[PDB]
Amino acid sequence: IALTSKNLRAIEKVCSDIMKGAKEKNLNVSGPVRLPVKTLRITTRKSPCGEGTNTWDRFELRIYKRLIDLYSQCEVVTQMTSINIDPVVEVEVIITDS
Amino acid sequence: KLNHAVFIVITPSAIAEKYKVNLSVARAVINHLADSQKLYT
Amino acid sequence: PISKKRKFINDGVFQAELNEFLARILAEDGYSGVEVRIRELTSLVQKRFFLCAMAQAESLRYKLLKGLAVRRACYGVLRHIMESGAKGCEVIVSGKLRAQRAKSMKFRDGYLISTGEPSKRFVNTATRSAQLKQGVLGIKVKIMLPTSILPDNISVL
Amino acid sequence: VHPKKYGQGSRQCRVCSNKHAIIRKYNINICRQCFRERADIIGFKKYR
Amino acid sequence: KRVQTFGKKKTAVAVATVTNGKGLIKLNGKNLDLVEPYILKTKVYEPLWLIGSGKLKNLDIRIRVKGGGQTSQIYAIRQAIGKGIISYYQKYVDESTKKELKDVLLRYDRSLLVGDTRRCEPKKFGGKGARARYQKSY
Amino acid sequence: EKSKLAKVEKVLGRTGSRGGVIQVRAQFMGRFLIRNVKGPVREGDILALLETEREARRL
Amino acid sequence: DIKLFKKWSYEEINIADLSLVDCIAVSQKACVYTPHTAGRYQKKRFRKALCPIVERLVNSMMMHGRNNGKKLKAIRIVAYAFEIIHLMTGENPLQVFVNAVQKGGPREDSTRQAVDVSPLRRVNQAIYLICTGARNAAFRNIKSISECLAEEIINCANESSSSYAIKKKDEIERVAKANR
Amino acid sequence: QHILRILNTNVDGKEKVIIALTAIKGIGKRMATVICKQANVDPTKRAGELTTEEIDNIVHIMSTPTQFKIPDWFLNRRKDLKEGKNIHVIANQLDSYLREDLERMKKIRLHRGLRHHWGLRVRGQHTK
Amino acid sequence: RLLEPVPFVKTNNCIKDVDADLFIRSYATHLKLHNKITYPKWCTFVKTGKGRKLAPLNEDWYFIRASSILRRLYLHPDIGVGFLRRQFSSKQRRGVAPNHTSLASGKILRSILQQLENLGYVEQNPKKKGRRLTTKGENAINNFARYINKKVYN
RNA sequence: AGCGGCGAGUACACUGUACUUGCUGCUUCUUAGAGGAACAUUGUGUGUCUAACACAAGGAAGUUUAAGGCAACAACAGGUCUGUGAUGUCCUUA
RNA sequence: UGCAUACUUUUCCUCCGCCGAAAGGCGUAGGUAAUCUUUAUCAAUAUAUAUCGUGAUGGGGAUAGAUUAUUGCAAUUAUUAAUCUUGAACGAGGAAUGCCUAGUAAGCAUGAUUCAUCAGAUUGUGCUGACUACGUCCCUGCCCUUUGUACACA
């Protein structure tokens, strides 16, 4: 079960939900995985005309990705996440045994 | 201009000025006497 | 089968459509929300895909477009902002204004922070434009939401 | 007609209706002239 | 038994594993003399003398090289080995000489034990140089 | 030619057309010699002069 | 307890002017096996002098044309130069450099009237003139840069005319004396 | 020993052979490096001992090298498109071939030939 | 000057414990004496790399590359055809255009790799697709490394 | 992704090593979630003894630790209707 | 060969084994991506030894000619390009000007953009870590105060 987004707190609270559910259900849940945050940078210049001191500004996209794993039924977790996720957060479910 | 040849301290710069020879033939003469820039033994 | 990197920019394109579509459709009232009238909206959206600063700014744009005097319309809308709760409001209108010389009038009242990233986070913006007989009018309404507490706001009880 | 899938005329801007100054970075295909103001509505902020 | 420490100055990195042995102080695969430049080899030799060859004879250091230029890598290696010897003296071998070793290391310089924050800044605007500008015409 | 010792204790001030000259006091004999210097001069430095009885202008 | 290039401990230092010694800051604190020490040099004022003189030479001799950044090449050239000096002059190369620095530095100058020169400025311009004499010696003169550096430094240590630093501090002294 | 006169200026007596044979022809040094390689002359020795037999070997290798192991790609004037084939033809006859192609160019009167007659390059030096 | 004092304890078990240049030249002489491979004559009229644009001018460059290819093969468990090209990438000044790095010719390195494959010093398997050196080559190079180490030691 | 441990070793050391293949005690080290540290801190000093700044020491951090982005009040008759189905007016439309 | 019709996805970087000096091609691993390119590693000035050893030389690479392949239904105004030949000035640049306060001057490279192909453009990053002040109004550009105006489109 890995979740990806752009903003910070929306995935922190969802991972807190993951941890509290793991503690409640006493599952064989592995520890949190802290993937590096990737940044994507594009360029664009102001001054729509050709004159003036050409100026260049940089915007950033801060992609996010965090992984966890659990040993339980997929239906209960795929209901529990949809209970307490936000529309701006996406998840993918992969199961483990030991 | 140059007028050095091969026909007639051990440092190449000193002996080249001593014998009025090019640096390459100076290195050759040094090797001949003993038997890029390096320190002494 | 698309990447997340291209998926999020496809989503950005979708929200680029959604912002302008919401701006066009939300004209008779405020911002009632979005869905993840209604029947037609959902049908069109599916077919193609497969305290309110914006509302107040649109109200003032309507009052200017109907031919009502800018001075009185702006004064009224500023009073409604003040009674809505924003500590102030920065409204500026530009265009021809009855003459051939470009001009603008700025109404100043209160704190009116105008720069800095905390200012941008706290303060929301609205800027609209519309046609006129011999030009185009531009209206800017800056509404600042009530302040977490501002770092400059200091008091000890 | 002679439409070709390559070159400058293969694609045009998706909004501004002018193909000049199209950015194809990250497969956006939106002209920069409109993209300057479309950056915020897409949600692509400027910080530094 | 064993200790694992780190050292980073500039972009170069270094991880040092210090363990008991017969003196197999090996930088990954290659030895510490075969790097080629003896100028950096002298600096590598510098921390060895201040501690003791007889002391180092009883311990093996596993040193890993990954990234950075020659000077940056040698500085990272020096930080890694300094932290390794300090931590090993604090942990396993002897505490009495640890204070003297760290005092003399501090006295000689500050760069031997902990590195520097000196790094490359993000590029500003005006010119190709990090603080240059285009030759404006007139 | 010759060089003779001098001592600087306190910085009186800086002058000059660009700010690069600092007024200082030397110590050979008297025990006070007005002089002007350029560059970094700190408290407690040892310097040298040209002649023992030539005086500058205080500004 | 430190030998320079594992050769010279330089335990003996001349009395000199008892100020250039402080400026060069030669001691076991600044004792170095090899050049190119990356300690902080632009922290405060005094760190300009806290740098070793051997480090200053290799930092300042490397400025001509495309030679910018060739600090390892500078280290090689100076290391060979010390070997050349130990051979063709019986005295210690460190003592040669020390004597050349103490006697080759200008003492007074002119910016307007004639003024004095800071002590850190004295050691700075001494290094500068030694390096720039090496530059003009190596500027298209058949003979090699290492020999140029060795000849210039020994000539400035022996106070002869063939050293550019020696013949240029004299010009500075005479021009400043003429001004005041 | 030094200063040996051949068809071209070959005063190269103190320098090395791999520059001596390039100075006279193939001053790009790669054609005359391969010529030296074919002739099998030691490069260690200098130009003060150029025997006549080595120059004879140079000319022998130069005379129609197509019968040797050298492929046509390395040889200049690979085709010079016509009914027949050719080879590198050394110095004066090399410039003779160049001017023969130049006069063929002129009588073919291409646009680039017109610019060449006017005194202009092909790509354009862009004085604009 | 080649040999330098070492304060730590050596092991002397492979070429990793010996300097690269001395070993590659010693093994170039070893292969020149043993006549294990050809020159080859076909590589003679082609320069080392496109960016080189000039003859290496040493008469043994092919043998030096032959001694270095397996040297890098021991260092890296898996390599590629472009690995040698990148390792021996050189400056290329396209006339007026500025310098850029460029890879050397791949046919010559492919051919010498085939030569050592015929010699048996290198083997290929579906698993670990990158080139690796066989077990017999391991002990051969180990013995040669210890064989040069003993003379260069004392 | 890193540090180890052992199942079998390739050769040497000696009473482990350069390199593989399979599993997992653990995560300063490959990475990062929040937070803290730094505030002329202290001491020797100047100052209308208030507001200030200097050296040294602890400290990675003593010019805000440093590059950045937000850029008002007001204007240019600066550029852009050749960027927009944003754009008025004069002009073209078989 | 040309049009019409159906099947995989050929429509990105590519590692491999070969063909071809190379360009480029062939059937393919991997990957919608810390997995595959590729990053226990992508460059260079350096490091060491060697041909040369300051003579516009073999430095220098402007120039055109002979061609092998790709990009593009179109490279002719020879795009891109592997090979050779061809061999201009250039002895460090006058009156003058621009940038420079510490991973910063300066030098060395590398990724991204527009791209069917093509950076010598702009931008992101890394390496080589320097010469120096640590202040001033004398130049210049701005600011305040005082003053004089017959200027106010100043």
Q: What is the CATH number of the domain that holds E1?
A: 3.30.230.10
Under an 8 Å CB criterion, which residues of A touch D? 40, 42, 44-46, 48, 57-61
3-state secondary structure chain E: CEEEEEECCCCCEEEEEEEECCCCCEECCECCCCCCCHHHHHHHHHHHHHHCHHHHCCEEEEEEEECCCHHHHHHHHHHHHHHHHHHHHHHCCCCHHHHHHHHHHHHHCCCCCCCCCCCCCCCCCCCCCCCCCCCCCC
Q: What is the CATH number of the domain that holds C113?
A: 3.30.1140.32
Compute the distance between CA of residue F3 and CA of residue E118 in angstroms, rounded to an integer.
41
Tokens 């704190």, residue located: C111
Window C6-65, strand K contacts by Cβ < 7 Å: 6
H71 preceded by a cis bond (ω within 30 of 0): no
Q: Determine how β-strand D30-31 pairs with β-strand D22-23.
A: antiparallel
Q: Is the dihedral of CA I136, I137, I140, I146 positive or negative?
A: negative
Calculate the CA D7 to chain-centre distance.
15
Number of cross-chain residue pairs from E and I with Cβ atoms under 8 Å apart: 33
CB < 7 Å to strand J — which of 48-87 in chain I?
A: 74, 77
Element (H, E) at C36: none
| Cα–Cα distance, D30 to F18 (Å, whole number) | 55
CA nearest to E44 within chain G? G33
Kind and range of the H or E element at G57? helix G53-60
Q: Protein contacts on strand K: list nucleotides below 7 Å from a Cβ.
A: 15-24, 32-34, 38, 40-55, 57-58, 60-68, 72-74, 76-78, 81-87, 92, 97-110, 112-116, 120, 122-136, 138
Interface of C with D (CB under 8 A): 5-6, 9, 12-13, 15-16, 19-20
State whether H107 and H87 are in the same domain: yes
Q: And the tokens for A30?
A: 């592995």
Touching chains, G (3+ CB pairs < 8 A): B, E, F
Contacts of H92 (CB under 8 A, 6+ apart): none
Q: Please give the Cα distance from I67 to I27 (Å, whole number).
A: 6
User: Which nucleotide across the nucleic acid strands is nearest to D23, CA versus C1'?
Assistant: K114
| Residue E35 backbone phi and psi in degrees, to 5 | -65, -35
- Identity at G96, one-letter amino acid code: V
Across I1-143, the runs of DSSP E, i.e. the strands, are 90-93, 99-102, 122-123, 132-133
Spell out the residues 6+ positions from residue C107 whose beta carbon is closer than 8 angstroms to its own.
C74, C78, C89, C90, C91, C92
3-state secondary structure of I73: helix
Token reading at E47: 């921390």
CA distance I46 to chain H (A): 9
Domain containing residue I61: 1-154
Q: Which domain holds residue H28?
A: 1-71
Distance CA C19, CA D44 (A): 14
Q: Which residue has the tokens 């040099």?
A: G41
By C-alpha distance, the chain C residue nearest D47 is: C117
Bases of chain J below 7 A from a protein C-beta are 2-4, 10-14, 16-21, 27-34, 55-56, 58, 60-61, 63, 65-76, 78-80, 83-89
- Which chains reach chain C with 3 or more Cβ–Cβ distances below 8 angstroms? A, D
Are H38 and H78 members of one domain? Answer: no
DSSP state of F28: -
Terminal Cα-to-Cα distance of chain B (whole angstroms) = 34
Residue A61: give its domain's CATH number. Answer: 3.30.70.600
Pick the CATH number of G1-180 from 2.60.40.10, 1.10.238.10, 1.10.357.10, 1.10.455.10: 1.10.455.10
Q: How far apart are CA H100 and CA I7, in angstroms?
A: 73
Q: Which residues, 6 or more positions from G112, have their beta carbon under 8 angstroms from its beta carbon?
A: F16, F17, F21
Tell me the backbone φ, ψ of residue I99, rounded to 5 degrees.
-75, 145
Q: How far is the CA of I80 from the C1' of J11 (A)?
A: 27
DSSP H helices, chain C, are: 4-25, 38-49, 53-65, 70-84, 117-122
- For strand K, list residues 9-28 of chain B whose Cβ lies within 7 Å of it: 22-25, 27
B neighbours by CB contacts (3+ pairs under 8 Å): G, H, I
The total number of structural domains in chain D stands at 1
Give me the number of domains chain A comprises.
1
Cα separations (Å) of A73 from A17, A67, A76, E63?
A: 17, 18, 6, 46
Domain count, chain H: 2
Which domains are delineated in chain F? 1-59 (2.40.50.140)
Q: How far: E1 CA to J23 C1' (Å)?
A: 24
Chain C residues 84-113, Cβ below 7 A from strand J: 102-104, 106
CA distance F5 to C98: 84
Which residues, at least 6 apart from C96, have a Cβ–Cβ distance to it below 8 Å? C102, C132, C134, C135
Identify which of B9, B17, B37 has the shortest CB distance to residue G146.
B37
G107-144: buried (b, 16+ CB within 10 Å) or exposed (e) per residue?
bbbeeeebbbbbbbbbbbbbbbbbbbbbbebbeeeeeb
Who contacts C60 (Cβ-Cβ below 8 Å, separation ≥6)? C73, C74, C77, C91, C139, C141
User: For residue E120, what are the domain limits?
Assistant: 1-138
Q: Domain residues for D18?
A: 1-48
Q: How far apart are the first and last CA of chain C?
A: 59
Q: Which of residues 34-73 of G touch strand J (CB under 7 A)?
A: 44-46
Interface of B with I in 1-40 (CB under 8 A): 38-39
Tokens of C137: 């009018």
Cβ pair D35, D23 in contact under 8 A: yes
Instruction: Collect all residues from A whose CB is shorter than 8 A from any CB in C.
Output: 4, 6, 40, 61, 63, 87, 90
- B 2-41 near G (Cβ less than 8 A): 9, 11, 13-14, 17, 37, 39-40
Contacts for E12 with CB less than 8 Å, ≥ 6 apart: E67, E68, E69, E72, E73, E75, E76
The one-character DSSP state at A36 is P
The 10 Å Cβ neighbour count of residue C149 is: 8
Identify all chain I residues contacting E55, using CB atoms and an 8 Å cutoff: none
CA distance C5 to D26: 8
Q: Which nucleotide is nearest to I76 (CA to C1')?
A: K40
Interface test with D, best of C19, C48, C127, C140 (most D CBs within 10 A): C19
Total number of domains constituting chain I: 1
Q: What is the domain partition of chain G in residue ranges? A: 1-180
The 3-state DSSP class for residue G82 equals helix
Strand partners, I115: none
Q: Which of chain H's residues have a Cβ under 8 Å away from the Cβ of I54?
A: 29-30
Q: Quickly list DSSP for H30-91.
A: HHHHHHHHHHT--SSSBGGG--HHHHHHHHHHHS-GGGSS--TTTSSSS--SSSS------H
Binding residues of D: 13, 16, 31, 34
Q: How far apart are CA E58 and CA E49, in angstroms?
A: 15
Question: Running DSSP on this structure, what letter comes out for residue F19?
Answer: S
The residue assigned the tokens 């001593």 is B18
Asked if C136 and C130 touch (Cβ cutoff 8 Å), the reply is yes
Q: How many contacts, defined by CB atoms under 8 Å, are there between A and D?
A: 24
**Residue set of the binding site of D for Zn(2+):** 13, 16, 31, 34
